[PDB]
Amino acid sequence: ARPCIPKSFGYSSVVCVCNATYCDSFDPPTFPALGTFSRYESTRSGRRMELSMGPIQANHTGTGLLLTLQPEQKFQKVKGFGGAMTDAAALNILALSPPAQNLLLKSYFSEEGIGYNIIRVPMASCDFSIRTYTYADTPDDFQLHNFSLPEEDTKLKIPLIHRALQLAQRPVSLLASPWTSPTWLKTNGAVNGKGSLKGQPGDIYHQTWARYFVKFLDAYAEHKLQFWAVTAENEPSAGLLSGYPFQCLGFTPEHQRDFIARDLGPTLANSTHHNVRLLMLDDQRLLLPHWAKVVLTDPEAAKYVHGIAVHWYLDFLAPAKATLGETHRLFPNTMLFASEACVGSKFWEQSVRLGSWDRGMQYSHSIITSLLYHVVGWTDWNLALNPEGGPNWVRNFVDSPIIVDITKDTFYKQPMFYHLGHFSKFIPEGSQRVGLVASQKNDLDAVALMHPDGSAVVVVLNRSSKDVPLTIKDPAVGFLETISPGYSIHTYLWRRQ
Amino acid sequence: ARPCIPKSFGYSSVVCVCNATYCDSFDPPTFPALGTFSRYESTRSGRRMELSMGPIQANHTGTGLLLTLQPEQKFQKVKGFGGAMTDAAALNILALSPPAQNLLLKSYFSEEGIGYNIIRVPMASCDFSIRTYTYADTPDDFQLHNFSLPEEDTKLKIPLIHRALQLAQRPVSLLASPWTSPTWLKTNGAVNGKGSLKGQPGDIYHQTWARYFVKFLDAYAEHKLQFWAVTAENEPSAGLLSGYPFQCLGFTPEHQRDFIARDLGPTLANSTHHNVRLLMLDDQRLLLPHWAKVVLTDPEAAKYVHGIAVHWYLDFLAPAKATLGETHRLFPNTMLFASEACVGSKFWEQSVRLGSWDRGMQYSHSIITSLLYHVVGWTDWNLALNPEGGPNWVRNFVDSPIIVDITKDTFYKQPMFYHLGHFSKFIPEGSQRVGLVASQKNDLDAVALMHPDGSAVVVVLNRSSKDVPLTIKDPAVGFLETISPGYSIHTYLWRRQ
Numbered sequence: 005a006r007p008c009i010p011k012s013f014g015y016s017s018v019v020c021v022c023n024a025t026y027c028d029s030f031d032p033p034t035f036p037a038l039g040t041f042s043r044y045e046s047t048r049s050g051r052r053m054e055l056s057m058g059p060i061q062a063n064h065t066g067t068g069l070l071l072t073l074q075p076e077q078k079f080q081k082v083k084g085f086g087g088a089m090t091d092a093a094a095l096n097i098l099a100l101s102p103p104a105q106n107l108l109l110k111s112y113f114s115e116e117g118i119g120y121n122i123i124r125v126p127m128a129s130c131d132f133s134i135r136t137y138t139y140a141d142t143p144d145d146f147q148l149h150n151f152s153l154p155e156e157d158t159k160l161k162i163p164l165i166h167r168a169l170q171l172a173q174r175p176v177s178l179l180a181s182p183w184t185s186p187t188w189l190k191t192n193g194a195v196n197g198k199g200s201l202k203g204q205p206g207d208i209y210h211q212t213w214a215r216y217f218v219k220f221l222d223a224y225a226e227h228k229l230q231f232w233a234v235t236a237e238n239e240p241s242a243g244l245l246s247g248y249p250f251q252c253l254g255f256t257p258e259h260q261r262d263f264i265a266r267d268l269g270p271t272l273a274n275s276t277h278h279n280v281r282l283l284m285l286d287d288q289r290l291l292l293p294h295w296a297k298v299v300l301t302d303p304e305a306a307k308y309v310h311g312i313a314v315h316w317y318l319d320f321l322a323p324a325k326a327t328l329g330e331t332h333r334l335f336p337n338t339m340l341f342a343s344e345a346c347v348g349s350k351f352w353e354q355s356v357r358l359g360s361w362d363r364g365m366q367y368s369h370s371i372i373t374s375l376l377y378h379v380v381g382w383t384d385w386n387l388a389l390n391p392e393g394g395p396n397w398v399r400n401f402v403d404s405p406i407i408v409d410i411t412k413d414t415f416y417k418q419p420m421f422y423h424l425g426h427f428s429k430f431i432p433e434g435s436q437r438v439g440l441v442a443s444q445k446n447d448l449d450a451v452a453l454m455h456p457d458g459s460a461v462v463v464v465l466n467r468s469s470k471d472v473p474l475t476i477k478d479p480a481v482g483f484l485e486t487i488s489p490g491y492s493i494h495t496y497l498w499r500r501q
Numbered sequence: 502a503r504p505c506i507p508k509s510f511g512y513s514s515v516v517c518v519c520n521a522t523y524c525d526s527f528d529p530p531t532f533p534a535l536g537t538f539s540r541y542e543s544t545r546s547g548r549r550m551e552l553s554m555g556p557i558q559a560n561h562t563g564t565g566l567l568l569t570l571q572p573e574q575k576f577q578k579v580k581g582f583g584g585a586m587t588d589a590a591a592l593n594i595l596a597l598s599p600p601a602q603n604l605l606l607k608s609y610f611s612e613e614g615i616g617y618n619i620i621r622v623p624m625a626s627c628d629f630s631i632r633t634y635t636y637a638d639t640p641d642d643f644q645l646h647n648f649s650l651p652e653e654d655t656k657l658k659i660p661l662i663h664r665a666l667q668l669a670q671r672p673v674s675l676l677a678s679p680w681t682s683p684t685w686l687k688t689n690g691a692v693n694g695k696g697s698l699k700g701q702p703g704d705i706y707h708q709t710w711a712r713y714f715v716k717f718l719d720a721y722a723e724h725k726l727q728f729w730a731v732t733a734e735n736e737p738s739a740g741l742l743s744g745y746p747f748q749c750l751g752f753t754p755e756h757q758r759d760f761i762a763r764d765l766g767p768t769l770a771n772s773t774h775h776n777v778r779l780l781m782l783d784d785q786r787l788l789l790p791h792w793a794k795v796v797l798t799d800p801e802a803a804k805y806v807h808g809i810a811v812h813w814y815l816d817f818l819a820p821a822k823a824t825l826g827e828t829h830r831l832f833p834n835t836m837l838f839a840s841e842a843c844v845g846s847k848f849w850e851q852s853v854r855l856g857s858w859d860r861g862m863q864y865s866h867s868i869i870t871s872l873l874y875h876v877v878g879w880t881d882w883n884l885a886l887n888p889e890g891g892p893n894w895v896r897n898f899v900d901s902p903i904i905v906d907i908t909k910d911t912f913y914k915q916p917m918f919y920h921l922g923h924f925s926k927f928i929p930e931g932s933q934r935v936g937l938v939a940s941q942k943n944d945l946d947a948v949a950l951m952h953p954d955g956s957a958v959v960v961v962l963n964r965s966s967k968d969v970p971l972t973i974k975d976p977a978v979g980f981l982e983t984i985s986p987g988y989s990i991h992t993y994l995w996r997r998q
């Protein structure tokens with residue numbers, strides 16, 4: 005329907021401007037006849053998910069690199085893509101006037117949008133909140149009667165989550181992650197810094213931290229929202245580092261293991277939410293395969309765990325083979341899921357860089373790499389932030405895909421947003437990654453998956469400056485002749501039958 | 502040269518039998534000397550455009566009826582006259598022996614015939630086809646790889662058009678019209694029934710439908726044929742009716758308006774055929790002025806519409822003033838044009854009355870009405886039918902100026918043929934209707950036009966049983982004393998210098 009309204013801010017590309025009466029959107033998707041492919045392009049130079057089409061001819065006039073689809077080579081199945089509804093995000097969003105709010109949600113969740121089917125939901129305050137609270141801050145309340153939900157959950161997170169699910173293309177799943185417990189179960193009695201839970205797994209401190217997990221669940225359920233999964237903690241490696249500034253609860257791998265085993269798992273198991281899946285190690289990729297080795301090799305924990313959740317900090321190198329690769333090898337039946345990613349901390353980079361293509365590229369390179377190493381789903385950090393890059397009670401240190409300019413009632417869509425969309429919109433839940441063979445060495449990143457209905461989808465990223473001539477072969481349909489422009493991103497689709 | 506060979510089938514008048522060795526034909530056209538007028542005469546009693554000549558008098562003594570030419574009451578200029586090359590027609594025409602054919606084509610297109618200067622051409626199958634087909638029946642071919650012309654076009658319609666042009670000496674203009682789009686573009690997936698273009702204008706369905714016109718014109722260009730104009734759709738209103746039996750595609754006027762502005766207009770504009778004119782509403786009179794108001798008050802639609810096309814059901818009433826007149830008043834610069842007419846649609850009447858005089862009169866009466874109300878030219882329906890009024894695949898049979906009996910290798914020219922001829926032969930493209938006031942109430946239908954060379958033509962029709970004596974005054978030259986025999990049609994021509 006409506007194209008991108010560009011705006012430069014002195015970066016290598018532009019964002020797209022939406023206010024309360026215009027936003028760039030998509031038409032109900034079409035499915036071109038067997039023999040016909042669809043392409044979506046976004047370029048640094050300015051193009052933004054633009055639909056074009058062409059032939060899958062059975063001749064082969066292309067003499068460069070070949071990408072051969074190998075549909076019989078079958079890999080993991082996809083949970084889906086989304087991002088987190090942090091206090092920050094909820095606040096920045098409700099700054100906007102209601103019509104702007106809807107153009108915004110639609111952008112993320114609608115078919116006119118990019119089809120998010122996941123929302124990560126922090127359990128009380130995190131660094132991206134305007135205050136440090138938990139759901140039971142009243143002291144020595146061990147059976148949890150003053151367990152309540154603040155204005156924050158009741159007015160901000162929850163009604164937006166409802167609206168998000170109304171607009172949604174597809175069914176949406178919900179993920180929870182606690183940052184810190186009530187401070188009267190902490191070795192340090194403080195929402196941050198080197199301070200774990202009190203006593204040892206099994207004891208009453210440990211048993212209450214588990215009941216809070218259940219309570220959060222009942223509480224969100226009165227408002228009629230069920231969770232697909234919860235993480236055991238967000239970033240527990242962090243609570244062992246003295247002077248950690250954000251809300252954090254320490255857990256050595258050995259500690260998480262025994263906690264899940266004796267407390268979290270059994271408590272969850274015995275409750276009406278026994279179907280909510282538990283995820284472990286909600287923390288950085290360099291903590292694997294070790295953390296997995298420790299938690300899962302003990303039978304009594306492992307039987308509760310459904311997946312391992314990881315974090316991409318896109319400012320840092322971290323070899324996938326040695327981390328995720330090795331992790332799948334050691335437990336091929338244990339799913340890998342990416343529960344947070346963000347970029348913007350390099351001290352010398354503005355936290356929010358409006359129209360940064362490099363950052364979009366970094367995003368996609370990260371998701372592709374993800375799926376080539378067995379990952380079932382990728383989840384962004386904040387849905388929306390301000391131009392400073394907040395509101396964060398400690399410091400802005402990360403960008404976001406949508407930035408909200410409250411003073412001008414407009415909001416902007418970063419190259420990030422579209423580099424994500426090239427995946428989330430075209431890989432429904434149930435899709436399965438399938439083989440895809442390069443004919444030769446190439447400066448491109450590629451990935452191929454297969455829709456539920458059995459149609460193909462291949463994302464191609466170019467991070468070099470040079471254009472790249474490319475042929476994608478599909479054994480059933482024939483050859484798809486194309487060029488992949490420098491600094492670009494294509495998502496190709498087609499029927500196979 | 503050769504006169505009509507008459508034969509009767511028990512109706513009020515005769516047909517002119519023609520075969521492979523004989524057909525009634527005209528001498529090469531001449532002009533009356535200044536001071537003399539020319540007459541062509543057709544009568545129920547058997548005279549078939551008989552040529553005679555007589556003097557223009559200096560003075561006139563009388564109390565009887567007086568038609569006064571008003572050379573300065575200048576009105577619409579004239580595009581011309583012709584008829585439609587439907588599959589049915591081509592098929593009938595092409596099933597006679599070759600010399601039977603040439604004679605049939607010359608009957609319509611030569612100077613020794615009635616010199617048609619328009620052929621309307623259906624873009625694929627109508628109800629006067631023997632099979633349903635589009636040019637793009639492969640489903641979801643949004644790119645129209647498999648767009649093409651089947652035999653109906655390539656061995657029937659085109660060859661016959663080339664031959665028709667060859668024989669014609671006035672330049673012939675072609676007009677093209679689609680009944681249905683491919684079925685994958687339509688909401689109901691059928692060639693018939695309530696249905697329309699999917700989605701909304703500016704979308705992919707609408708963009709394709711547009712491209713289809715251009716492909717259409719591409720293909721006909723490759724066979725060295727250019728079209729003067731196309732219609733936005735044949736009988737759009739019909740596509741809006743539950744149960745509709747034959748090829749169609751339904752537009753509300755808003756739909757048609759928006760389609761024209763957003764898709765059809767631009768697409769034609771950005772192509773080699775931009776010169777091709779575009780006519781809106783290829784439907785019945787009662788839709789005016791409404792449809793006219795809806796399309797023509799939107800300037801993004803108006804800039805594309807070169808005129809308004811109307812269908813004339815002769816068995817059926819419409820008030821000329823409240824329809825055409827009013828429309829001319831609102832849009833004097835959008836030409837009215839008649840794209841179709843037929844007799845024998847109405848449920849209770851026979852499709853073919855061979856030799857029906859009553860039918861010819863119904864023709865000229867209403868072609869004169871057309872001219873009186875700013876219609877710039879006229880296009881009959883099927884050039885040739887069979888004695889059933891077909892073939893037609895929903896059995897939607899109706900009459901035709903020429904009826905072909907293949908078992909006898911013989912075709913029959915009807916009163917309609919000559920009734921049309923009285924106009925088509927004597928009103929070259931560029932003629933301008935002028936005023937003609939009567940001196941008193943009277944049973945005649947008349948019309949006056951001036952040719953491009955400056956000389957006069959007046960058609961006089963008598964639908965009463967009684968001879969009317971009358972005089973035509975033209976101040977430049979004098980008086981024509983004549984009689985309109987009862988149940989007759991006369992065409993008069995004279996120089997003015």
Ligand SMILES: *[C@@H]1O[C@H](CO)[C@@H](O[C@@H]2O[C@H](CO)[C@@H](O)[C@H](O)[C@H]2NC(C)=O)[C@H](O)[C@H]1NC(C)=O
Nearest residue numbers: 503506507518519520521522523524909910911
């Ligand atoms: C076609 O029509 C012509 C004219 O009607 C027919 O020839 C005439 O009819 C009879 C038969 O010989 C003769 O008395 C006349 O000499 C003919 N008249 C003229 C003007 O030619 C002829 O029979 C028909 N042709 C065919 C092939 O059936």
Ligand SMILES: *[C@@H]1O[C@H](CO)[C@@H](O)[C@H](O)[C@H]1NC(C)=O
Nearest residue numbers: 037038039639640646647648
């Ligand atoms: C369309 O046309 C091409 C070339 O003429 C042909 O090889 C192909 O098989 C056709 N496709 C379909 C779907 O009919």
